[PDB]
């Protein structure tokens, strides 16, 4: 049976609330995590993420945060109707959401802030030179299959080792979580073990998007096709999803109810802001943009109602059609959505197919727009290329260089470890200190840290600050 | 007396909504603002324009991300006001019991758009554009004007012209504000929406010493001649006397007041120009009371923790201050009447924040950096202003000629064709509604087009405010 209040859980990993609370208390709970995740400097870092189009002086353009604040805003239009429907239909009180009505729409609001503050510098493409770098270094092809006499991978420790070892599959695990770095597992890793927010079981659980581990080798079960679609969190993770399930009532590779609905937000946002970023970068006009397009009532109803005027009615139109229909989606399939076995989207539409559609074929596809994504590559790649002797590093080398901060023997190494952020290179000792020593799998987790400790970096770069230090890096500044 | 239902008005200027509407319909009319506004490229533009510090390449504070951390405070007073209303069982008496989410919707937006109509270069882009017009048409002999139609032998009509000499060179980002929503941005807002955005209620004109009745809300001015009769239709709206502010006004202040400094000392922190350490130092030199209370309790917590429970404890003690003082006073407040801000002076609340003021001033505010910023910014708006002289210095029929066949001035059709259409339009359409046959329409014109002027450069970046002088400047 439905129940909300075993859902939305109002306690905290670390110093937590204790005990019965007033639905007020409950309230200054969820408003303490709206005000950690507004002041936190990662989501001030979004205003520095590119959101399609590169960040100009002439930058009426969007970036990261401006479209996470427009997400927000449809994630609490869906949240609000999912609200007055059930509330219309005597099922509030009947589903536990009578006292948690105002959570309920502020998770999804703070869930939709940060649904991008994992993504890399580049998006898609600092993605992607992540994990064909880190694909290139240590082979996770490779591990599939039984231990193989030219297994490619060049850390040494990470080598499966021949007929002899459970620990075999610790490395399958480490070389494949590492090359599937993915902005969604990144956030989870960046609001727990990074950022510190200590933010409230419920809110940490709209953020997990995907259920699929990153270390995941198989074809995901069909059950759960859609849900495991890509990774949701880091083997580094692993121990703090298992009690974030257990806290929110979540079954194995179940979603947290709520997520349905920043994700359907998620949806509807997509596009339609960067199709009137195109028109604003002058790459077509209203009237051409239009053309392309050609469904009456959004659409054709928009263009008679210049530039604003289309697109704050088309916006309008788009969003009154569609946020009902992913409401009463939601409420029809809450039973499923509840358990977090639902495996399909709010909005699984064709509007949206349409506005994605023209925004491939004349946005997505501008020689600037895809002159970025091949640099920004270039970028990260050099980056990772730059920062790879710390990676080259024995465990004892290594060691000495964490512990004595300034090395003698490394001063490259030495240069490049001060590099790096302290809050990442505070989590690798935390993390590392936990291991015990002793075990023959400490240098496997070890490498994996270290390994994470330089993703971490790398990803948690603004798009600028990653140009920049590509460039003062290869001594052209 | 006190019904909320009589301020928080769901109409629109053009195409308004009408009749009788369900709790819900009206929760989607405010709600259909908020995407207006959060979708508005005046508020993308705030991510450019720069709060305290220079742009760098990246944590710091920006026009836009303050303004977002003021919506949150903004809320909190808000949502505090709604949760005492509610134990105190007025909520239903004073109206608010449906109206209860576009309540604290008005207050979230209203803090947004606080900020909106500030020009590039902050208090000296404001500086800049006054000097600049101060030195043309000099309001001082009204009360030297290069200006022949507005030099005052007789007549009526200079009346006009001691309106809009002063208007003019009374240049300030809450007016502004208010004639970018309406005139400029074409937004269609609610009335309650930019009720709570006129925060002063002092015309731009105004040239006597305000009444001692709303001294305090006539501070500084917060509409222009030229919206003088949207004004007229927006207090008509929303019940509101002759200089008298909007009930929820007061709030977005308050949620304004506590944001002020706070944010600038924790980047000031991070640009390190000294240590948590050494800033709380500074906070006791300048000082079991509210100071142990909220400062002395947030660094033993520490000793990014320090200013977590800095902002925490000063929240949870301003915040119902504030709450309670709203209800505390709401029957004047509720008139628009109030003479007073939620957190006034006499208060050891108060006296925190100015404490918070004081140390920033001392130490943030007269960086060398800061400071630099602000002597080029008022290059940048003064150089960008003399660039488009030659436009104000046409004659009517000569400007007029240009409007209309978009030869004889090369250099001025250029020039004109750089302001953004929307600006331009917003001439067009107010020149075209005065009528050509009277004797005051030279003296309106040339308002209208310094005011379009004025529009251009207040509605730049400060990037772009820079950029456009570079190129202009043929460098
Ligand atoms: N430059 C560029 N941008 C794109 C392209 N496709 C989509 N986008 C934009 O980039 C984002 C890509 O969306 P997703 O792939 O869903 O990113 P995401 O939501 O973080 O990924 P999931 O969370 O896994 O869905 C969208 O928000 C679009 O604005 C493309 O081909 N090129
Ligand atoms: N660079 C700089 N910034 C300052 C200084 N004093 C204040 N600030 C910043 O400017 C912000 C706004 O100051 P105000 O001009 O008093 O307020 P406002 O938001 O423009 O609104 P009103 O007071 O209603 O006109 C503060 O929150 C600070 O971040 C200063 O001397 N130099
Ligand atoms: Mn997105
Ligand atoms: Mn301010």
Redesign the interface.
Known sequence: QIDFRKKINWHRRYRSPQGVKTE?EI?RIF??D???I??S?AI??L??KTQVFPLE???????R??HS??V??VG??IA?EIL?RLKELKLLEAYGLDELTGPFESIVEMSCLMHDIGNPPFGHFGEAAINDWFRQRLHPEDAESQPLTDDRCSVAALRLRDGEEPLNELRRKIRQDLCHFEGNAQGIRLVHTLMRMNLTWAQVGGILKYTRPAWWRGETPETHHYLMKKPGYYLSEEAYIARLRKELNLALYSRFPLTWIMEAADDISYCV?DLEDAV?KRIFTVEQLYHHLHFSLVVENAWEKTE??F??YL??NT?NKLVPYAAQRFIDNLPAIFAGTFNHALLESDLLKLYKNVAVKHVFSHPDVERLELQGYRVISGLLEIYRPLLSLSLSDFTELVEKERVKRFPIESRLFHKLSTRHRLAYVEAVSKLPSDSPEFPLWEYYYRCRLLQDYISGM?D??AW?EYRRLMAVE
């Open positions: 007020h309230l408003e303490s709206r005000g950690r507004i002041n400097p001030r870092r205003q520095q002086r002439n930058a009426a353009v969007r970036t945060l401006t604040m427009e927000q805003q609490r239009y609000k007055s802001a604003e604003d005027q697109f704050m916006r309008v969003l603004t600028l600050y920049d």
